[PDB]
């Protein structure tokens, strides 16, 4: 609830601060309406090149447990 | 990239069918272990003979 006020909106964590006091099934109607409407912003398109190489970029590690793998 | 490599410990399985009976061993040459050498011989008082 922080990152959503450096993002700017304020009338978001002021409903969802006004409903953690009560925790209640009642209100939660309201906060599943939040939830869907975030994802009515639209698409989140970029460019084929920056999708796979921060995609297909990791970080891979030899110290990793091997006892675990073999039983994996 | 580099991949981590990982080897599974494992062994091949075959079936009864295909088990390859023993080759049977013949030899080439003797079983040695001792061999002749040529060594000096010293006498009795120490001089080469």
Sequence with gaps: LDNMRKAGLT?????????????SIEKFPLMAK???????????????LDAALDQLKTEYTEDVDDEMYREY | KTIPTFEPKESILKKLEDIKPEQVKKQTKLFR???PRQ?????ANGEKE
């Design chain 2, 39 to 43: 060594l000096p011989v010293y006498r």
């Design chain 1, 34 to 48: 939040i939830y869907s409407w975030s994802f009515h912003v639209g698409f989140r398109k970029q460019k084929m």
């Design chain 1, 11 to 23: 009338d978001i964590p002021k409903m969802i601060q006004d409903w953690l006091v009560d925790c």
């Design chain 2, 33 to 35: 272990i001792f061999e």
